[PDB]
mmCIF file of C-alpha atoms in Angstrom:
data_model
loop_
_atom_site.group_PDB
_atom_site.id
_atom_site.type_symbol
_atom_site.label_atom_id
_atom_site.label_comp_id
_atom_site.label_asym_id
_atom_site.label_seq_id
_atom_site.Cartn_x
_atom_site.Cartn_y
_atom_site.Cartn_z
ATOM 1 C CA UNK A 1 11.062 27.555 -20.221
ATOM 2 C CA UNK A 2 10.439 23.990 -19.095
ATOM 3 C CA UNK A 3 12.595 20.947 -18.345
ATOM 4 C CA UNK A 4 10.519 17.789 -17.909
ATOM 5 C CA UNK A 5 12.122 14.587 -16.680
ATOM 6 C CA UNK A 6 10.914 10.993 -16.832
ATOM 7 C CA UNK A 7 12.207 7.436 -16.575
ATOM 8 C CA UNK A 8 12.557 7.064 -12.818
ATOM 9 C CA UNK A 9 11.204 4.174 -10.795
ATOM 10 C CA UNK A 10 12.123 1.200 -8.659
ATOM 11 C CA UNK A 11 14.835 -0.946 -10.206
ATOM 12 C CA UNK A 12 16.703 -3.937 -8.870
ATOM 13 C CA UNK A 13 20.468 -3.612 -8.273
ATOM 14 C CA UNK A 14 22.645 -4.601 -11.222
ATOM 15 C CA UNK A 15 20.040 -3.518 -13.778
ATOM 16 C CA UNK A 16 20.044 -0.593 -16.218
ATOM 17 C CA UNK A 17 17.764 2.447 -16.478
ATOM 18 C CA UNK A 18 17.483 5.393 -18.888
ATOM 19 C CA UNK A 19 16.360 8.836 -17.713
ATOM 20 C CA UNK A 20 14.934 11.423 -20.111
ATOM 21 C CA UNK A 21 14.820 15.211 -19.881
ATOM 22 C CA UNK A 22 12.794 17.120 -22.473
ATOM 23 C CA UNK A 23 13.242 20.839 -22.876
ATOM 24 C CA UNK A 24 10.813 23.491 -24.035
ATOM 25 C CA UNK A 25 11.232 27.213 -24.578
ATOM 26 C CA UNK A 26 15.008 27.354 -24.934
ATOM 27 C CA UNK A 27 17.598 27.188 -27.705
ATOM 28 C CA UNK A 28 18.424 23.618 -26.569
ATOM 29 C CA UNK A 29 20.842 22.973 -29.432
ATOM 30 C CA UNK A 30 22.968 25.792 -28.031
ATOM 31 C CA UNK A 31 22.954 24.800 -24.360
ATOM 32 C CA UNK A 32 25.315 22.672 -22.334
ATOM 33 C CA UNK A 33 23.373 20.226 -20.137
ATOM 34 C CA UNK A 34 24.105 18.486 -16.835
ATOM 35 C CA UNK A 35 22.796 15.706 -14.670
ATOM 36 C CA UNK A 36 22.936 16.241 -10.888
ATOM 37 C CA UNK A 37 21.641 13.829 -8.255
ATOM 38 C CA UNK A 38 20.635 13.855 -4.618
ATOM 39 C CA UNK A 39 20.354 10.858 -2.317
ATOM 40 C CA UNK A 40 17.450 11.016 0.151
ATOM 41 C CA UNK A 41 18.268 13.423 2.970
ATOM 42 C CA UNK A 42 21.631 14.299 1.446
ATOM 43 C CA UNK A 43 23.353 16.955 -0.640
ATOM 44 C CA UNK A 44 23.699 17.727 -4.328
ATOM 45 C CA UNK A 45 26.269 15.809 -6.398
ATOM 46 C CA UNK A 46 27.226 16.502 -10.020
ATOM 47 C CA UNK A 47 26.972 13.472 -12.311
ATOM 48 C CA UNK A 48 27.831 14.496 -15.889
ATOM 49 C CA UNK A 49 27.826 17.226 -18.503
ATOM 50 C CA UNK A 50 27.446 17.269 -22.277
ATOM 51 C CA UNK A 51 28.372 20.122 -24.617
ATOM 52 C CA UNK A 52 25.667 21.796 -26.698
ATOM 53 C CA UNK A 53 26.583 19.838 -29.855
ATOM 54 C CA UNK A 54 27.354 16.574 -28.070
ATOM 55 C CA UNK A 55 31.031 16.799 -29.004
ATOM 56 C CA UNK A 56 32.356 16.674 -25.428
ATOM 57 C CA UNK A 57 31.203 14.897 -22.250
ATOM 58 C CA UNK A 58 32.638 14.700 -18.737
ATOM 59 C CA UNK A 59 31.660 12.453 -15.846
ATOM 60 C CA UNK A 60 31.914 12.051 -12.079
ATOM 61 C CA UNK A 61 34.517 9.366 -11.272
ATOM 62 C CA UNK A 62 31.930 7.155 -9.616
ATOM 63 C CA UNK A 63 29.924 6.784 -12.848
ATOM 64 C CA UNK A 64 32.729 6.654 -15.454
ATOM 65 C CA UNK A 65 32.543 3.485 -17.557
ATOM 66 C CA UNK A 66 29.037 2.924 -16.239
ATOM 67 C CA UNK A 67 26.783 5.899 -17.141
ATOM 68 C CA UNK A 68 26.473 7.636 -20.524
ATOM 69 C CA UNK A 69 25.127 11.117 -21.097
ATOM 70 C CA UNK A 70 23.791 11.867 -24.580
ATOM 71 C CA UNK A 71 21.314 14.061 -26.357
ATOM 72 C CA UNK A 72 18.925 14.179 -29.274
ATOM 73 C CA UNK A 73 18.792 17.831 -30.252
ATOM 74 C CA UNK A 74 16.128 17.047 -32.866
ATOM 75 C CA UNK A 75 13.859 15.923 -30.002
ATOM 76 C CA UNK A 76 15.162 18.532 -27.516
ATOM 77 C CA UNK A 77 15.934 15.618 -25.223
ATOM 78 C CA UNK A 78 18.778 14.841 -22.829
ATOM 79 C CA UNK A 79 19.444 11.235 -21.751
ATOM 80 C CA UNK A 80 21.223 9.484 -18.933
ATOM 81 C CA UNK A 81 21.798 5.774 -19.648
ATOM 82 C CA UNK A 82 22.746 4.060 -16.405
ATOM 83 C CA UNK A 83 24.230 0.593 -15.868
ATOM 84 C CA UNK A 84 25.005 -1.745 -12.960
ATOM 85 C CA UNK A 85 22.951 0.204 -10.439
ATOM 86 C CA UNK A 86 23.591 -0.162 -6.693
ATOM 87 C CA UNK A 87 21.933 1.139 -3.513
ATOM 88 C CA UNK A 88 24.497 3.955 -3.712
ATOM 89 C CA UNK A 89 22.758 5.214 -6.876
ATOM 90 C CA UNK A 90 19.353 5.691 -5.229
ATOM 91 C CA UNK A 91 18.607 9.407 -5.689
ATOM 92 C CA UNK A 92 16.505 12.098 -7.261
ATOM 93 C CA UNK A 93 18.172 12.885 -10.597
ATOM 94 C CA UNK A 94 17.916 16.456 -11.911
ATOM 95 C CA UNK A 95 18.716 17.790 -15.351
ATOM 96 C CA UNK A 96 19.979 21.350 -15.550
ATOM 97 C CA UNK A 97 21.027 23.706 -18.314
ATOM 98 C CA UNK A 98 24.477 25.207 -17.931
ATOM 99 C CA UNK A 99 22.814 28.566 -17.240
ATOM 100 C CA UNK A 100 20.901 26.812 -14.423
ATOM 101 C CA UNK A 101 17.313 26.122 -15.367
ATOM 102 C CA UNK A 102 16.577 22.894 -13.458
ATOM 103 C CA UNK A 103 14.095 20.081 -14.084
ATOM 104 C CA UNK A 104 11.675 18.847 -11.393
ATOM 105 C CA UNK A 105 13.719 15.695 -10.748
ATOM 106 C CA UNK A 106 12.876 12.032 -11.192
ATOM 107 C CA UNK A 107 13.354 9.477 -8.402
ATOM 108 C CA UNK A 108 15.470 6.374 -8.913
ATOM 109 C CA UNK A 109 15.111 3.736 -6.175
ATOM 110 C CA UNK A 110 17.489 0.770 -6.285
ATOM 111 C CA UNK A 111 16.231 -2.154 -4.192
ATOM 112 C CA UNK A 112 16.226 -5.955 -4.191
ATOM 113 C CA UNK A 113 13.317 -6.194 -1.761
ATOM 114 C CA UNK A 114 9.816 -6.960 -3.029
ATOM 115 C CA UNK A 115 7.500 -3.981 -3.308
ATOM 116 C CA UNK A 116 4.324 -3.864 -1.232
ATOM 117 C CA UNK A 117 1.277 -1.616 -1.568
ATOM 118 C CA UNK A 118 -0.145 0.224 1.454
ATOM 119 C CA UNK A 119 -3.246 -0.408 3.496
ATOM 120 C CA UNK A 120 -5.190 2.853 3.825
ATOM 121 C CA UNK A 121 -7.395 3.677 6.821
ATOM 122 C CA UNK A 122 -9.523 6.739 7.592
ATOM 123 C CA UNK A 123 -8.721 9.013 10.518
ATOM 124 C CA UNK A 124 -11.934 10.598 11.773
ATOM 125 C CA UNK A 125 -13.043 11.972 15.159
ATOM 126 C CA UNK A 126 -15.328 9.806 17.301
ATOM 127 C CA UNK A 127 -18.708 11.218 16.244
ATOM 128 C CA UNK A 128 -19.347 14.354 14.188
ATOM 129 C CA UNK A 129 -20.162 16.414 17.263
ATOM 130 C CA UNK A 130 -16.780 18.039 17.763
ATOM 131 C CA UNK A 131 -15.936 20.024 20.859
ATOM 132 C CA UNK A 132 -14.843 22.948 18.677
ATOM 133 C CA UNK A 133 -15.140 24.829 15.386
ATOM 134 C CA UNK A 134 -12.164 23.055 13.831
ATOM 135 C CA UNK A 135 -12.085 19.354 13.016
ATOM 136 C CA UNK A 136 -9.236 17.152 11.821
ATOM 137 C CA UNK A 137 -9.516 14.264 9.380
ATOM 138 C CA UNK A 138 -6.826 12.036 7.965
ATOM 139 C CA UNK A 139 -5.709 8.752 6.515
ATOM 140 C CA UNK A 140 -3.289 6.190 7.842
ATOM 141 C CA UNK A 141 -1.146 4.820 5.019
ATOM 142 C CA UNK A 142 0.270 1.635 6.480
ATOM 143 C CA UNK A 143 2.858 -1.041 5.655
ATOM 144 C CA UNK A 144 4.309 -0.244 2.237
ATOM 145 C CA UNK A 145 7.678 -0.618 0.535
ATOM 146 C CA UNK A 146 9.582 1.155 -0.767
ATOM 147 C CA UNK A 147 9.166 4.907 -0.299
ATOM 148 C CA UNK A 148 7.480 7.093 -1.424
ATOM 149 C CA UNK A 149 3.745 7.462 -1.249
ATOM 150 C CA UNK A 150 2.120 10.763 -2.210
ATOM 151 C CA UNK A 151 -1.224 12.005 -0.891
ATOM 152 C CA UNK A 152 -3.676 14.606 -2.132
ATOM 153 C CA UNK A 153 -7.099 15.609 -0.841
ATOM 154 C CA UNK A 154 -10.173 15.949 -3.070
ATOM 155 C CA UNK A 155 -7.907 15.468 -6.115
ATOM 156 C CA UNK A 156 -5.783 18.497 -5.216
ATOM 157 C CA UNK A 157 -8.722 20.862 -4.707
ATOM 158 C CA UNK A 158 -8.019 20.778 -0.981
ATOM 159 C CA UNK A 159 -4.552 22.012 -0.043
ATOM 160 C CA UNK A 160 -4.817 24.545 2.770
ATOM 161 C CA UNK A 161 -4.455 22.935 6.202
ATOM 162 C CA UNK A 162 -2.995 19.716 4.781
ATOM 163 C CA UNK A 163 -0.046 18.030 6.500
ATOM 164 C CA UNK A 164 1.471 14.815 5.187
ATOM 165 C CA UNK A 165 3.959 13.352 7.633
ATOM 166 C CA UNK A 166 7.370 11.905 6.757
ATOM 167 C CA UNK A 167 7.196 8.127 6.697
ATOM 168 C CA UNK A 168 8.349 6.093 9.669
ATOM 169 C CA UNK A 169 10.212 2.801 9.237
ATOM 170 C CA UNK A 170 8.619 -0.062 11.171
ATOM 171 C CA UNK A 171 10.059 -3.191 12.772
ATOM 172 C CA UNK A 172 8.290 -4.832 9.821
ATOM 173 C CA UNK A 173 10.924 -3.230 7.626
ATOM 174 C CA UNK A 174 7.950 -1.508 6.014
ATOM 175 C CA UNK A 175 6.916 2.152 6.002
ATOM 176 C CA UNK A 176 3.909 3.928 7.472
ATOM 177 C CA UNK A 177 2.702 7.523 7.414
ATOM 178 C CA UNK A 178 -0.426 9.593 7.824
ATOM 179 C CA UNK A 179 -1.871 12.614 6.077
ATOM 180 C CA UNK A 180 -4.168 14.945 7.956
ATOM 181 C CA UNK A 181 -6.184 18.034 7.176
ATOM 182 C CA UNK A 182 -8.032 20.510 9.395
ATOM 183 C CA UNK A 183 -11.442 21.759 8.218
ATOM 184 C CA UNK A 184 -14.413 23.646 9.672
ATOM 185 C CA UNK A 185 -16.580 21.427 11.899
ATOM 186 C CA UNK A 186 -19.625 22.941 10.203
ATOM 187 C CA UNK A 187 -18.517 21.398 6.897
ATOM 188 C CA UNK A 188 -18.740 17.931 8.437
ATOM 189 C CA UNK A 189 -21.839 16.527 6.754
ATOM 190 C CA UNK A 190 -21.885 19.098 3.967
ATOM 191 C CA UNK A 191 -18.524 18.431 2.318
ATOM 192 C CA UNK A 192 -17.087 15.108 1.156
ATOM 193 C CA UNK A 193 -13.460 14.515 2.097
ATOM 194 C CA UNK A 194 -11.412 12.002 0.144
ATOM 195 C CA UNK A 195 -7.719 11.290 0.442
ATOM 196 C CA UNK A 196 -5.964 10.212 -2.751
ATOM 197 C CA UNK A 197 -3.121 7.814 -1.993
ATOM 198 C CA UNK A 198 -0.561 6.911 -4.686
ATOM 199 C CA UNK A 199 2.209 4.317 -4.373
ATOM 200 C CA UNK A 200 3.773 4.050 -7.812
ATOM 201 C CA UNK A 201 6.232 1.248 -6.924
ATOM 202 C CA UNK A 202 3.327 -1.177 -6.338
ATOM 203 C CA UNK A 203 0.987 0.386 -8.903
ATOM 204 C CA UNK A 204 -1.417 1.187 -6.060
ATOM 205 C CA UNK A 205 -3.928 4.041 -5.862
ATOM 206 C CA UNK A 206 -6.506 4.240 -3.061
ATOM 207 C CA UNK A 207 -9.164 6.841 -2.216
ATOM 208 C CA UNK A 208 -10.459 6.715 1.391
ATOM 209 C CA UNK B 1 38.712 18.048 -6.735
ATOM 210 C CA UNK B 2 37.824 21.460 -5.342
ATOM 211 C CA UNK B 3 36.311 21.018 -1.883
ATOM 212 C CA UNK B 4 33.623 23.483 -0.812
ATOM 213 C CA UNK B 5 32.963 23.875 2.923
ATOM 214 C CA UNK B 6 29.853 25.736 4.016
ATOM 215 C CA UNK B 7 29.254 27.226 7.457
ATOM 216 C CA UNK B 8 27.411 27.169 9.707
ATOM 217 C CA UNK B 9 25.709 23.788 9.137
ATOM 218 C CA UNK B 10 22.472 25.217 10.485
ATOM 219 C CA UNK B 11 21.394 28.806 10.941
ATOM 220 C CA UNK B 12 18.313 29.664 12.968
ATOM 221 C CA UNK B 13 17.032 33.233 12.690
ATOM 222 C CA UNK B 14 13.832 35.246 13.094
ATOM 223 C CA UNK B 15 12.029 36.886 10.185
ATOM 224 C CA UNK B 16 13.492 40.342 9.551
ATOM 225 C CA UNK B 17 16.959 39.297 10.681
ATOM 226 C CA UNK B 18 20.033 39.520 8.464
ATOM 227 C CA UNK B 19 21.432 36.116 7.514
ATOM 228 C CA UNK B 20 25.056 35.544 6.516
ATOM 229 C CA UNK B 21 26.086 32.216 4.946
ATOM 230 C CA UNK B 22 29.712 31.271 4.233
ATOM 231 C CA UNK B 23 31.349 29.099 1.566
ATOM 232 C CA UNK B 24 35.073 28.348 1.511
ATOM 233 C CA UNK B 25 36.924 26.658 -1.349
ATOM 234 C CA UNK B 26 40.077 24.515 -0.909
ATOM 235 C CA UNK B 27 41.583 26.437 -3.797
ATOM 236 C CA UNK B 28 40.811 29.598 -5.749
ATOM 237 C CA UNK B 29 37.799 29.325 -7.996
ATOM 238 C CA UNK B 30 38.112 32.999 -8.924
ATOM 239 C CA UNK B 31 34.486 34.186 -9.200
ATOM 240 C CA UNK B 32 33.049 30.937 -10.624
ATOM 241 C CA UNK B 33 30.785 30.361 -7.643
ATOM 242 C CA UNK B 34 26.992 30.147 -7.524
ATOM 243 C CA UNK B 35 24.431 29.928 -4.720
ATOM 244 C CA UNK B 36 21.240 27.843 -4.800
ATOM 245 C CA UNK B 37 18.128 27.672 -2.664
ATOM 246 C CA UNK B 38 16.358 24.358 -2.172
ATOM 247 C CA UNK B 39 12.985 24.342 -0.425
ATOM 248 C CA UNK B 40 11.428 21.075 0.817
ATOM 249 C CA UNK B 41 10.257 18.815 -1.996
ATOM 250 C CA UNK B 42 11.561 21.163 -4.684
ATOM 251 C CA UNK B 43 14.375 21.374 -7.188
ATOM 252 C CA UNK B 44 17.250 23.756 -6.381
ATOM 253 C CA UNK B 45 16.894 27.316 -7.662
ATOM 254 C CA UNK B 46 19.756 29.596 -8.721
ATOM 255 C CA UNK B 47 20.041 32.707 -6.504
ATOM 256 C CA UNK B 48 23.453 34.164 -7.290
ATOM 257 C CA UNK B 49 25.925 33.436 -10.091
ATOM 258 C CA UNK B 50 29.526 34.546 -10.700
ATOM 259 C CA UNK B 51 29.749 35.143 -6.903
ATOM 260 C CA UNK B 52 27.715 38.368 -6.851
ATOM 261 C CA UNK B 53 25.220 38.566 -9.745
ATOM 262 C CA UNK B 54 21.535 38.116 -8.826
ATOM 263 C CA UNK B 55 19.705 35.620 -11.066
ATOM 264 C CA UNK B 56 16.439 36.289 -12.871
ATOM 265 C CA UNK B 57 13.382 36.768 -10.689
ATOM 266 C CA UNK B 58 15.406 36.651 -7.481
ATOM 267 C CA UNK B 59 14.320 39.136 -4.736
ATOM 268 C CA UNK B 60 16.625 42.061 -3.866
ATOM 269 C CA UNK B 61 17.154 40.798 -0.300
ATOM 270 C CA UNK B 62 19.527 38.163 -1.703
ATOM 271 C CA UNK B 63 23.099 39.207 -2.478
ATOM 272 C CA UNK B 64 26.502 37.558 -2.762
ATOM 273 C CA UNK B 65 30.112 38.563 -2.378
ATOM 274 C CA UNK B 66 33.598 37.148 -2.604
ATOM 275 C CA UNK B 67 36.278 35.878 -4.937
ATOM 276 C CA UNK B 68 39.114 33.378 -4.744
ATOM 277 C CA UNK B 69 38.427 31.102 -1.779
ATOM 278 C CA UNK B 70 35.976 32.958 0.508
ATOM 279 C CA UNK B 71 32.325 33.605 -0.367
ATOM 280 C CA UNK B 72 29.241 34.925 1.378
ATOM 281 C CA UNK B 73 25.511 34.769 0.654
ATOM 282 C CA UNK B 74 23.521 37.436 2.511
ATOM 283 C CA UNK B 75 19.789 37.564 3.084
ATOM 284 C CA UNK B 76 19.334 41.153 4.186
ATOM 285 C CA UNK B 77 15.934 40.574 5.792
ATOM 286 C CA UNK B 78 14.773 36.995 6.237
ATOM 287 C CA UNK B 79 11.254 35.809 5.401
ATOM 288 C CA UNK B 80 9.424 32.646 6.489
ATOM 289 C CA UNK B 81 9.445 31.482 2.842
ATOM 290 C CA UNK B 82 13.277 31.455 2.964
ATOM 291 C CA UNK B 83 13.164 28.214 4.973
ATOM 292 C CA UNK B 84 15.427 26.024 2.837
ATOM 293 C CA UNK B 85 18.832 24.466 2.417
ATOM 294 C CA UNK B 86 21.329 26.715 0.632
ATOM 295 C CA UNK B 87 24.193 25.309 -1.450
ATOM 296 C CA UNK B 88 27.233 26.799 -3.176
ATOM 297 C CA UNK B 89 28.664 25.282 -6.375
ATOM 298 C CA UNK B 90 31.968 26.028 -8.115
ATOM 299 C CA UNK B 91 32.309 25.922 -11.915
ATOM 300 C CA UNK B 92 36.039 26.674 -12.099
ATOM 301 C CA UNK B 93 36.803 23.119 -13.111
ATOM 302 C CA UNK B 94 35.668 19.517 -13.386
ATOM 303 C CA UNK B 95 34.162 17.800 -11.560
ATOM 304 C CA UNK B 96 31.623 20.439 -10.570
ATOM 305 C CA UNK B 97 31.440 20.383 -6.765
ATOM 306 C CA UNK B 98 28.867 21.563 -4.200
ATOM 307 C CA UNK B 99 29.128 22.536 -0.571
ATOM 308 C CA UNK B 100 27.312 20.314 1.884
ATOM 309 C CA UNK B 101 24.567 22.885 2.360
ATOM 310 C CA UNK B 102 23.454 25.218 5.128
ATOM 311 C CA UNK B 103 19.972 24.691 6.499
ATOM 312 C CA UNK B 104 18.285 27.988 7.314
ATOM 313 C CA UNK B 105 15.578 27.502 9.919
ATOM 314 C CA UNK B 106 13.085 30.163 10.973
ATOM 315 C CA UNK B 107 12.927 31.272 14.620
ATOM 316 C CA UNK B 108 9.308 32.285 15.155
ATOM 317 C CA UNK B 109 7.488 32.922 18.427
ATOM 318 C CA UNK B 110 5.992 30.306 20.729
ATOM 319 C CA UNK B 111 2.771 28.712 19.451
ATOM 320 C CA UNK B 112 0.774 26.059 21.307
ATOM 321 C CA UNK B 113 -0.356 22.889 19.540
ATOM 322 C CA UNK B 114 -3.963 22.148 18.693
ATOM 323 C CA UNK B 115 -4.387 18.524 19.768
ATOM 324 C CA UNK B 116 -6.634 15.883 18.152
ATOM 325 C CA UNK B 117 -7.049 12.164 18.938
ATOM 326 C CA UNK B 118 -8.186 9.456 16.472
ATOM 327 C CA UNK B 119 -9.544 6.023 17.431
ATOM 328 C CA UNK B 120 -8.674 2.942 15.330
ATOM 329 C CA UNK B 121 -11.069 2.576 12.402
ATOM 330 C CA UNK B 122 -13.523 0.072 11.035
ATOM 331 C CA UNK B 123 -11.313 -1.868 8.646
ATOM 332 C CA UNK B 124 -7.927 -1.709 10.384
ATOM 333 C CA UNK B 125 -9.202 -3.803 13.212
ATOM 334 C CA UNK B 126 -10.264 -6.567 10.758
ATOM 335 C CA UNK B 127 -6.524 -7.153 10.516
ATOM 336 C CA UNK B 128 -5.241 -8.010 13.992
ATOM 337 C CA UNK B 129 -3.903 -4.537 14.868
ATOM 338 C CA UNK B 130 -5.053 -1.203 16.355
ATOM 339 C CA UNK B 131 -3.526 2.206 15.602
ATOM 340 C CA UNK B 132 -4.603 5.202 17.644
ATOM 341 C CA UNK B 133 -3.231 8.526 16.476
ATOM 342 C CA UNK B 134 -2.563 11.739 18.355
ATOM 343 C CA UNK B 135 -2.134 14.870 16.258
ATOM 344 C CA UNK B 136 -0.335 18.024 17.444
ATOM 345 C CA UNK B 137 -0.984 20.730 14.899
ATOM 346 C CA UNK B 138 0.758 24.007 14.016
ATOM 347 C CA UNK B 139 3.080 24.586 16.957
ATOM 348 C CA UNK B 140 6.529 25.999 17.828
ATOM 349 C CA UNK B 141 9.177 25.163 18.983
ATOM 350 C CA UNK B 142 9.599 21.628 17.712
ATOM 351 C CA UNK B 143 10.162 20.032 21.117
ATOM 352 C CA UNK B 144 6.954 18.559 22.510
ATOM 353 C CA UNK B 145 6.210 15.783 24.949
ATOM 354 C CA UNK B 146 3.431 13.339 24.203
ATOM 355 C CA UNK B 147 2.352 10.721 26.728
ATOM 356 C CA UNK B 148 -0.099 7.906 26.067
ATOM 357 C CA UNK B 149 -2.402 6.699 28.832
ATOM 358 C CA UNK B 150 -4.627 3.642 28.797
ATOM 359 C CA UNK B 151 -6.707 3.637 31.991
ATOM 360 C CA UNK B 152 -4.260 6.154 33.439
ATOM 361 C CA UNK B 153 -1.450 3.666 32.794
ATOM 362 C CA UNK B 154 1.467 5.376 31.058
ATOM 363 C CA UNK B 155 2.608 3.593 27.897
ATOM 364 C CA UNK B 156 6.149 2.885 26.716
ATOM 365 C CA UNK B 157 7.797 1.374 23.649
ATOM 366 C CA UNK B 158 4.528 1.114 21.747
ATOM 367 C CA UNK B 159 4.421 4.481 19.967
ATOM 368 C CA UNK B 160 6.190 6.224 17.083
ATOM 369 C CA UNK B 161 6.385 9.923 16.309
ATOM 370 C CA UNK B 162 6.772 11.801 13.040
ATOM 371 C CA UNK B 163 7.252 15.542 12.595
ATOM 372 C CA UNK B 164 6.781 17.747 9.532
ATOM 373 C CA UNK B 165 9.278 20.239 8.190
ATOM 374 C CA UNK B 166 8.762 23.887 9.145
ATOM 375 C CA UNK B 167 5.772 25.440 7.307
ATOM 376 C CA UNK B 168 6.889 27.891 4.610
ATOM 377 C CA UNK B 169 4.213 30.468 5.472
ATOM 378 C CA UNK B 170 3.870 30.372 9.270
ATOM 379 C CA UNK B 171 7.046 28.482 10.301
ATOM 380 C CA UNK B 172 5.207 26.036 12.588
ATOM 381 C CA UNK B 173 5.536 22.258 12.896
ATOM 382 C CA UNK B 174 2.962 19.511 13.175
ATOM 383 C CA UNK B 175 3.558 16.125 14.825
ATOM 384 C CA UNK B 176 1.850 12.769 14.903
ATOM 385 C CA UNK B 177 2.165 10.097 17.570
ATOM 386 C CA UNK B 178 0.835 6.643 16.754
ATOM 387 C CA UNK B 179 0.204 4.086 19.492
ATOM 388 C CA UNK B 180 0.179 0.628 17.934
ATOM 389 C CA UNK B 181 -1.440 -2.300 19.709
ATOM 390 C CA UNK B 182 -2.939 -5.697 18.885
ATOM 391 C CA UNK B 183 -6.707 -5.583 18.144
ATOM 392 C CA UNK B 184 -7.349 -7.920 21.039
ATOM 393 C CA UNK B 185 -5.427 -5.674 23.419
ATOM 394 C CA UNK B 186 -7.433 -2.649 22.174
ATOM 395 C CA UNK B 187 -10.442 -4.202 23.962
ATOM 396 C CA UNK B 188 -8.971 -5.112 27.329
ATOM 397 C CA UNK B 189 -9.289 -1.319 27.823
ATOM 398 C CA UNK B 190 -11.792 1.546 27.637
ATOM 399 C CA UNK B 191 -10.021 4.876 28.086
ATOM 400 C CA UNK B 192 -7.463 6.124 25.550
ATOM 401 C CA UNK B 193 -5.757 9.459 26.125
ATOM 402 C CA UNK B 194 -2.942 11.526 24.670
ATOM 403 C CA UNK B 195 -1.437 14.096 27.106
ATOM 404 C CA UNK B 196 0.678 16.923 25.654
ATOM 405 C CA UNK B 197 3.152 19.303 27.248
ATOM 406 C CA UNK B 198 4.801 22.099 25.297
ATOM 407 C CA UNK B 199 6.373 25.539 25.821
ATOM 408 C CA UNK B 200 3.218 27.137 24.410
ATOM 409 C CA UNK B 201 0.871 25.612 26.997
ATOM 410 C CA UNK B 202 0.453 26.903 30.550
ATOM 411 C CA UNK B 203 -0.902 23.491 31.575
ATOM 412 C CA UNK B 204 -0.885 20.003 30.033
ATOM 413 C CA UNK B 205 -3.571 19.303 27.435
ATOM 414 C CA UNK B 206 -5.249 15.902 27.278
ATOM 415 C CA UNK B 207 -7.455 14.553 24.506
ATOM 416 C CA UNK B 208 -9.255 11.270 25.059
ATOM 417 C CA UNK B 209 -11.959 8.868 23.939
ATOM 418 C CA UNK B 210 -13.793 5.870 25.349
ATOM 419 C CA UNK B 211 -13.998 2.294 23.944
#
């Protein structure tokens, strides 16, 4: 059972956007479907529902006359067609079956401001000769807009000991964060460590 | 619409403790009330439906009770992995409505930070700015004091902090402090130090580097 969403991205206010949710492993034609959204740092809010056969739809007041929920049962796909977007509409949008299988979410960011890709800088200790058996490495991801950036290490082969900090908003109006990882000092010189930085809004991918 | 009020807003308990979360509806929703768990960076997950039925694959320590306007979600013995925000949702009528959530935080024992300091790199300094980073790793509680010293001169207004969410396995936090200065000011000085005080330390810990 899988619900896979797509369609999210950065969009300027006033514009339209269509979100898709494709289902696998369920009798989709027999399931009611919902959209639910969640602003950053906030709670869950129901957006709309559509009956299994498409014959009935209901909406949250704040999207009536503006959003349309629909489905293509022959493609096992649920749609949300949005119009006249505002900052208010910035959220992760989830699809959910009526019996509560949920998709992974897709982020919609509504912003007039120009997007900017990050500068990426290594964080390494000042030598190689640590004072202990554990070392920390990292990358500074600096001056980007808008959120988010995602970071992996060694293409996701390195996960244990990884901490990626919540972004901080600068006086610049831009964002900065860092990602760090702790590793054995003995591996310094043996093992290559690469951070994989991804900032989809500016089509930027960097690997220091 | 049917208003759902959850309490308390935040609940902070040790692993093994019993946790009791409340949801109150402004009018009867009969038993059309579900509970969800949402861990950091994840979609919500159904725990309990129809007030008291455990969903598929949900551990036995989760249970629910109530009908009409008063509802309870119980975690009979809390685990570190239960760090999450918990929501109730009514499906008695339209629009569907959610409570505002209860954040369940894990009260573990005191753990001192491992501290690391990073000089500004190569490239960054080509642009006219210097960022020196102090890392405090895997500690508890969240409160920590970080002081920057350049030549034993305490710094102010030139640093920003960021703190992770509680770790799902060990319930600790990590924190970064970034001192940001102009490249040309990062050479009027030699000694850069981060000094840390925390409940887990018996004495302040200082990490430093020269030039």
